[PDB]
Amino acid sequence: VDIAQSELFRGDIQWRSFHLEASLMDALLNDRPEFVRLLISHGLSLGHFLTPMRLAQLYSAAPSNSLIRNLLDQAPPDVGHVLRMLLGKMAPWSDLLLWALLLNRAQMAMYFWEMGSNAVSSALGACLLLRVMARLEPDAEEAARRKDLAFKFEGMGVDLFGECYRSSEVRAARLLLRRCPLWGDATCLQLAMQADARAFFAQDGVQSLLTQKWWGDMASTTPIWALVLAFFCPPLIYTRLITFRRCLRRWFHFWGAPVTIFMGNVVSYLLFLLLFSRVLLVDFQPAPPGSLELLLYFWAFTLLCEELRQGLSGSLSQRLRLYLADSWNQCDLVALTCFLLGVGCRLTPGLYHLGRTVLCIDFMVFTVRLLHIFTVNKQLGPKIVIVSKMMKDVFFFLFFLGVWLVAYGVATEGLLRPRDSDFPSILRRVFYRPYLQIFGQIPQEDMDVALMEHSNCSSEPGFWAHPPGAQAGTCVSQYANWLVVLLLVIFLLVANILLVNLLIAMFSYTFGKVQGNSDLYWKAQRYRLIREFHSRPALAPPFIVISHLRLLKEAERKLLTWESVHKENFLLARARDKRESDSERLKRTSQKVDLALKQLGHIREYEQRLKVLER
Amino acid sequence: ARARDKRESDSERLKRTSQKVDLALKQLGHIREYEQRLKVLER
Amino acid sequence: RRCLRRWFHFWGAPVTIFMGNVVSYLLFLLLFSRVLLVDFQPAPP
Ligand SMILES: [Ca+2]
Q1: Neighbours of B (≥3 Cβ pairs closer than 8 A)?
Q2: How close is the nearest chain B Cα to the Cα of A597, in Å?
Q3: Do A566 and A531 belong to one domain?
Q4: Are C42 and A421 within 8 A, CB to CB?
Q5: If DSSP codes are grouped into helix, strand and coil, which group holds residue A317?
Q6: Quick check: B31 and A603 CB within 8 A?
Q7: Do A221 and A343 belong to one domain?
Q8: Do A120 and A237 belong together in one domain?
Q9: Long-range pairs of A170-177 with CB within 8 A, sequence gap ≥ 24
């Protein structure tokens, strides 16, 4: 391009818009980024240039049997349909940006986004489109390039918004994010959530906005103890303790805040568990259910209704699979399913014990759900995410332990030759007994012959000893008992020491490695938690039934200009820093010295002629 | 590509730009020596 | 033939050979344990 700009665009040649339209098409079709930037920069009217026929020609230039080419074949560009079934379907710069992203041209989309209008929205939208198409690309190498470009687009979206937030917190946080653009008629946060743009949620501006939405109409600096006191003392909200008709508006603001909904839900869930335990341990009888058991049945029924409302209103198949995609929602679904089985079996005349048994296991699932609380805390949310990533280490330890238990367990059983020889008992002595030896339960009197008396039990040849244990067998062989003791010594060394300490080292390495990513993941998923509690009914699950029964311009242009101004300021600063770098400075100073050498040589040539002429 | 990157490195660029300036100094000295003779001859 | 080629391709794949060997090895261990714990007697095998 330097040769073309220096020679053709030195200004001597008078150009025209039509003289460059053909060249502009060629640069676009042949992936020439610096040229299209140069051609447009030379006073070319893009708006009058682009035509639907030209746009159709641009999309016809998809490279051979490309992924994008397949979508047009399945789908007159008709790109609207291609956009709809990609996203989900639940200004020439924008069109050019879409074309570049579909064709996976980095610098084209790079340049087009810089000239776009809704830069923050487009950057997140570009990241979403690239990631979903990268997952859909079978090339397995172009997808890597798509993910790279998606990371780049997420990059400036963070950088541009960070600059916008620093200038005007009110303008950037409130209006720029919570707005519906033409991209998908969805807020920038929704685009980031769908794109899983974790780095976008990591910045302080997004986090500060989320906290304000989380706290509703109350000050984000309100202490936790102040909230709890107001929760248990409703009149306390009408004092100076909480900082925000007048009385009704304040009342609804406090009880409509997502944090108070979370706190109210948490207290209700704890009471439900307490009621569940009381019924299970005491009030559960073969007789027809009592008053408390009926209350528990009603309480669980509303919990089922609330979970149904979340899934139904969270495109019926599209939202249903979205609701089921959350692990916690899966935990809720299985807990309610077991509860239904327990109630059905309990009411059955001949299945009372089975009904109680499954309910006890069902209580375990409900109690485990309580871990969702720690996701709210800033210092505990990352910890839970790391715990989820430790499962790979746990599985390795379990598989290693399982092999060792089988090897040691069967050999010890084979050497002892207990005369019980019963399949339930054999399994106990092979798996159960060695397992407890890991945790300090070593029944030496059940394997060491020296600790048990000698007796005659069977007519089989050899010597036998009578263990005192109930499940240790009637009598065991004592042919080579030193080996059984030796195997116990080796088993304790491998299991109690080597394997356990190995897992600790594996946990320590994993915790340090995934610490950063988990923090990003928790920050990204923090928006999902806030959105879920934002639309939840204001009442507690026991009382949520009544809520369910009740349930059944110039400013925009000014904001966009303000965003666009900050974009050009950010770009100019980045370019200025690039030009002011040492490497660029070394590049420039080399050019000037070369120019000095050429001019010096001209002086030398001038010197000889002048001296010769003078003589 | 490896050789081009080596030549485009800052250290190599510093090496080259030092050579050209040294050439400029030698040519400048030639001009200075030419300057004295021409001025003397003119007088 | 097409059916035979597909059949041999599946059962000739190294991963399926590994999976088939793994299942066989587990069965061998299970048979080994059953003989050792129960069927092992001083009588002829
Ligand atoms: Ca839920």
Answers
A1: A
A2: 6
A3: no
A4: no
A5: helix
A6: yes
A7: no
A8: yes
A9: A171/A559, A171/A562, A172/A205, A173/A205, A173/A208, A173/A209, A173/A212, A174/A209, A175/A555, A175/A559, A176/A120, A176/A559, A176/A563, A177/A120, A177/A206, A177/A209
Do A536 and A504 fall within a single domain?
no
- What is the domain range of residue A582? 553-615
- Residue A354 is encoded by which pair of tokens? 């089975």
Residues C37, A460: C-beta atoms closer than 8 Å: no
Reading the block at residue A458, the tokens are 């069977």
Task: Quote the tokens at residue A298.
Answer: 């009603």
Q: Is the dihedral of CA A113, A119, A121, A123 positive or negative?
A: positive
Q: Answer yes or no: are the C-beta atoms of A314 and A322 closer than 8 Å.
A: yes
Q: What is the largest CA-CA distance in chain C?
A: 54
Q: Kindly state whether residues A450 and A575 are assigned to the same domain.
A: no
The last residue of a domain, from among A524, A543, A577: A524
Coil, strand or helix at C10: helix
Residue A87 resides in a domain: no
**Does the annotation list A310 as a binding residue?**
yes
User: Is residue A84 assigned to a domain?
Assistant: no
Q: Does a structural domain hold residue A481? A: yes
* HEC letters along A218-254: CCCCCCHHHHHHHHHCHHHHHCCCCCCCHHHHHHHHH
Across the interface, which of C29, C37, C42 has its CB nearest the CB of A413?
Answer: C37
Is position A216 annotated in a ligand binding site?
A: no
One domain, residues A538 and A561: no
Question: What is the DSSP track for A432-457?
Answer: IHHHHHTTT---HHHH-GGGS-B---
Mutate to test the interface with B, among A600, A605, A609 (most CBs of B within 10 A): A600
Last residue within a domain, chosen from A342, A373, A389: A389
Letter string b/e over residues A10-35, b meaning 16 or more CB atoms within 10 A of that residue's CB: eeeeeeeeeebbebbbebbeebbbeb
H/E run at residue C33: helix C14-34
Give residues with Cβ within 8 angstroms of A38, minimum separation 6: A1, A4, A5, A9
Instruction: Give alpha helix (H) positions in A422-543.
Output: 423-427, 433-437, 444-447, 481-492, 500-513, 515-534
Looking at the structure, do residues A327 and A397 belong to the same domain, yes or no? Answer: no
The reply to whether A74 sits in an annotated binding site is no
Instruction: For residue A414, give how far its alpha carbon lies from the nearest alpha carbon of chain C (Å).
Output: 5
Residue C14, chain A, CB below 8 Å: the answer is no
Q: Do C38 and A414 touch (CB under 8 A)?
A: no
| Structure determination method | cryo-EM
Name the CA radius of gyration of chain B, rounded: 18
Residue A468 belongs to a domain: yes
Cα A319 to Cα A66: distance, rounded to the nearest angstrom: 31
Q: How many domains does chain A have?
A: 5
In chain B, which residue's Cα lies nearest the Cα of A604?
B31
Same domain, A104 and A251: yes
User: Does any CB of chain A come closer than 8 Å to the CB of residue C3?
Assistant: no
For A385-394, the CB contacts below 8 A with 24+ separation are: A385/A518, A385/A519, A385/A521, A385/A522, A386/A510, A386/A511, A386/A514, A386/A515, A386/A518, A389/A510, A389/A514, A389/A518, A390/A507, A390/A510, A390/A511, A392/A510, A393/A503, A393/A506, A393/A507, A393/A510, A394/A503
